[PDB]
Ligand binder design. Structure first.
Ligand code: NAP
Ligand code: NAP
Ligand code: AKG
Ligand code: AKG
Ligand code: MG
Ligand code: MG
Lengths: 414, 414
């Protein structure tokens, strides 16, 4: 095992769904491939400064490197891309952070980000998107976007259940569908690839339960179930209907005049929360035209994959969008962008995706005060037009900063 | 049969993939449900005026109403939503136009727009999107968007091959996948719905063939295959690879330095056309940030469904986006928006989606001169800030017009 546990840290423990976070917690981190070598050192500098400015010395994180991706073959052997040890270790230390990851081609494995998500049963991909004043945006009014995506991570088409065209197994599957199930709707059965998309009662409800609980705790105004439920009646329509049934049964929602929309009342607050639904293709237009009407969004794995990237772009956040995959027994926060090898080692890219996922991390842990400091920091740096090439390209009069230098500018504005 | 063929028209005939369009062609049209009662009369006024201003009297269309949707039950019986007669008739008269359509709930049928597409084997959904100067847009620079989507219409998840959770058939399908195929990747097998997504060699290639032929005839600069090919290796990755193989083999494309991008040379023109690919979620960001780098887009059925609505929105075109479903033996042009019953009969909505799909219609037919007139018309009306409520809501100083009045304003600016 080649991980070295810090000598002075202590482990987070989970007691009754609530975290027990010590003053010296050990947090494992995965450096990441590609530009992970640039953004990750900046996020450690900055999380470390945010806990010192905040808790004035009492709290310290003991960071612990663990491995996945190309940096793990360089450490464990040519063919070890996801060591079982990292899975045990994220479950054991309960909270962790990672940078971008390379999956090699063909060679068995799925996509390492999905493999972690699924193997560790991290069913909530929580990706909030919000505007930071100052970001170059391609949209006229990007400040209307404050949204939070709850993307179901354990099923949908992402389960990887598929077969290559013309292989024996694909043909078996199609002899099955035609002969045993009476399926006449395949246009070209020869030279045809097949994939299976599953959507289940427990899988959508644990996600929507999470989404409506997230709305109540943070006093948000609506939850939108988005779906292409009119073509995919039983995976995606069932997703809309189960989500409505969950808000009636467990949250006591009741009809708004004709319906279908339900109103769930916030028990801590009195405000009513709307549970509504939008067909998925009209949603991608609604988020650009009426973006103030939407808030928490709940969806299956593929739709959420796309909604979040569309949303991140309109607010000018391709490179600063945060992300977290959360399950019942642990969480893994991540940079949402790729590895970008062209720019690796050159200290120029924007480190704000992983830093803002460290914000989510701390907030999860309960160190709200360090986490609000990291967003005070980043709102200052961007507003001082002090920024990395990606934002400098598009801006009228800014100071170009290296990636390390931008972490310092965040510490500077706390 | 309750269709009445015009006394004076003549039928378009197809000879060697080329259309023979007489001076008096009969064109069937479907009025549409909901606001189809408002926009369709405006499109007939305007196509009729555009052929008279253009061909000064020699050419006349003989319009022929046919039926699908709610207006067909009112004509054929409570349960007749898609008369076999309309399918025979679109195939027979070769070209047709429709407004928005209602599909009832549950009661068997799929979604009538898809049922036509599929039953009539209309494999190309061609949806071009372009900015008309003057449209209220939510994006800063919407004029950079000139794109053309080629969406595969006959397969992908849209084939409707799916089973309800807990039904006997779904369980059969899962006893099959676990027991016979060795599938361990379903998270919750009980209470699970299943859908099948097929993607085939002939289906993607007839679409990409069409897309690269469309690029060469119109002198466009690139074709982008978009796909989530890294999770769906065999439906969607195969889509990327077959599309590349088609441009090497049939169009003689050759590598750009490292590749993967191929360059196909336009035989009529000398310009080189780039065939490139973008993973689908990065595409939804690339279209908002670098929109000038993309042009003709080729994709499977679900991705295209979403790309086009995202694109239509950024240029301010929710209600003016044109559409066409094209096959080898006929075409059916359509309004892309819904029925909107709230506003039906009130003459207020925007008729520019079906009118701009009539533009595509004429262009297809070869009446280029009437078709360029209809876009001269619509660029004048919008630029004279003379417009329907949807655009008047968002605009600084315009004349509000009824839907019929807006068709007149288009005739006025030809
Ligand atoms: O690999 P990938 O996946 O190809 O990510 C795509 C692109 O987005 C940009 N990008 C990725 N991560 C970023 C980050 N953290 N900060 C700024 N830009 C980032 C770069 O765009 P550009 O190359 O356009 O700067 C990069 O080539
Ligand atoms: O049914 P649908 O499907 O719900 O279409 C959605 C909405 O887009 C708008 N819409 C649909 N067709 C339109 C058209 N032809 N012109 C202008 N707006 C249109 C209306 O938006 P709004 O109700 O926002 O005007 C309509 O309620
Ligand atoms: O990079 C990958 O592993 C694909 C994942 C992806 O788009 C994501 O997590 O959003
Ligand atoms: O209205 C329908 O039939 C669904 C179709 C749809 O979004 C479309 O054709 O783009
Ligand atoms: Mg993604
Ligand atoms: Mg659509």
């Amino acid at each position: 095992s080649k991980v070295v546990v810090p000598a002075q840290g202590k482990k987070i423990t989970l007691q009754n769904g609530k975290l027990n976070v010590p003053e010296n917690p050990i947090i494992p981190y995965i450096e990441g491939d590609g530009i992970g070598v640039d953004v990750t050192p900046a996020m450690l500098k900055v999380v470390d400064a945010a806990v010192e400015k905040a808790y004035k010395g009492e709290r310290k994180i003991s960071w612990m490197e663990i491995y996945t991706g190309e940096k793990s073959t360089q450490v464990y052997g040519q063919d070890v891309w996801l060591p079982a040890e990292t899975l045990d270790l994220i479950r054991e230390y309960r909270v962790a952070i990672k940078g971008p990851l390379t999956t090699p081609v063909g060679g068995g494995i799925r996509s390492l980000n999905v493999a972690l998500r699924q193997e560790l049963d991290l069913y909530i991909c929580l990706r909030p998107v919000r505007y930071y004043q100052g970001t170059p945006s391609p949209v006229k009014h990007p400040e209307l976007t404050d949204m939070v995506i709850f993307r179901e991570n354990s099923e949908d088409i992402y389960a990887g259940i598929e077969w290559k065209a013309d292989s024996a197994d694909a043909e078996k599957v199609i002899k099955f569908l035609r002969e045993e199930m009476g399926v006449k709707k395949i246009r070209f059965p020869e030279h045809c690839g097949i994939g299976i998309k599953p959507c289940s009662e427990e899988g959508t409800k644990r996600l929507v339960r999470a989404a409506i609980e997230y709305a109540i705790a943070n006093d948000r105004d609506s939850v939108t179930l988005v779906h292409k439920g009119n073509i995919m009646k039983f995976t995606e329509g069932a997703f809309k209907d189960w989500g409505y049934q969950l808000a009636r049964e467990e949250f006591g929602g009741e009809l708004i005049d004709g319906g279908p929309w339900l109103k769930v009342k916030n028990p801590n607050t009195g405000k009513e929360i709307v549970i509504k639904d939008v067909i998925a293709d009209a949603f991608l237009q609604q988020i650009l035209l009426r973006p103030a009407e939407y808030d928490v969004i709940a969806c299956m794995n593929l739709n959420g994959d796309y909604i979040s990237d569309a949303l991140a772009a309109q607010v000018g956040g391709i490179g600063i969008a945060p992300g977290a995959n959360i399950g019942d027994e642990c969480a893994l926060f991540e940079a949402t962008h790729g590895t970008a090898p062209k720019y690796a080692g050159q200290d120029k890219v924007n480190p704000g995706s992983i830093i803002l996922s460290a914000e989510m991390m701390l907030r999860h842990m309960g160190w709200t005060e360090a986490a609000d400091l990291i967003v005070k920091g980043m709102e200052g740096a961007i507003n001082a037009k002090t920024v990395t090439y990606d934002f400098e390209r598009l801006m009228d009069g800014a100071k170009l900063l290296k990636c390390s230098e931008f972490g310092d500018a965040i510490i500077e504005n706390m």
